[PDB]
Amino acid sequence: NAMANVKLLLPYILKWEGGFVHDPADAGGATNKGVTIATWKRVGYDKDGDGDIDVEDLKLLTDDDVLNRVLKPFYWDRWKADLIESQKVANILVDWVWGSGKYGIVIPQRILGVQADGIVGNKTLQAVNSADPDELFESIFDARREFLEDITARSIKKYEDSIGRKATERELLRHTNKRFLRGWLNRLEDIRKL
Template identity: 50%
Template sequence: MANAKLLQPFILRWEGGFVNDPLDRGGATNKGITIGTFRQFYGKDATVEQLKNITDEQWLHIFKSGYWNPWKADEIVNQSIANIVVDWAWASGPGTSIKQVQGVLEVVADGIVGPKTLAAINSADQRTLFADIHAARLKFVENIVRRDPTQARFLKGWKNRINDIKFEA
């Protein structure tokens, strides 16, 4: 079964520290946690300063509760599949990533990981499923830029990150 601790260093390596890029829709972000997400977990009055000083425990709580657990990733057999779907959730939100992957799996795209979604993930040929999710994710970020060309400056980085997730049996 997949292990959240194996994905954490990947996310932290790609996210870095505090940024507040005016063209980034997420706004103020630290270690990949946007101010909006931080406020969902720590109250609507949480400040950018508090986000700048996020603790490892707060980060881990958000990662597990907000991204790993909605995917029920502890129940995904292949670590590489868990990595690519949870990282997609991290980048685009759990509901979006779950629906996108459910589309790849050809199960009802309800945004909820239940027994049918998990069974479809775990019974699929893992290498093929990884490749299909990888391709869908690349197409997804390309479509973001197609809809909103101001996001083009992020495309290369998004693709590099996606391509950095490798399949391991």
């Protein structure tokens, strides 16, 4: 009867939004900044029903403030993830909403065969927990790959339609979601490893 725990998702969110790593204490404990794949409200995000939580820069808050004031109330609890019994299922659903907003509810609702109304009610939660956790995680993972590829293909199409010709690779990396796709997919793959 173990429930998913938001605390286990937090390090993953912080890792990729911040790009920080810390030296251990006896080396001086320096915070070092490197590869960053920040997705908060950035990945084809639909803000409808998100509560309008914003901060100037997540990197300037404590871990506890990110957890208690942003991630748990507005994202984790939006999936009622305290009632999701599979940690990995909760992780991948909540992270989808973190990056993409309402899409991270409505697409899973379609996968689950429940009304895709963007509200996680009892029927949606029942469907999540009734599913085999491994099967459901993989189906969500398939759909998240599909989503990232789809918003990238559409971004490329919009741009090429606008310029009236095929874009160069340089143009696509400057002007479209192709810029972000590698990082988005790599960050997604990393969620399997929690």
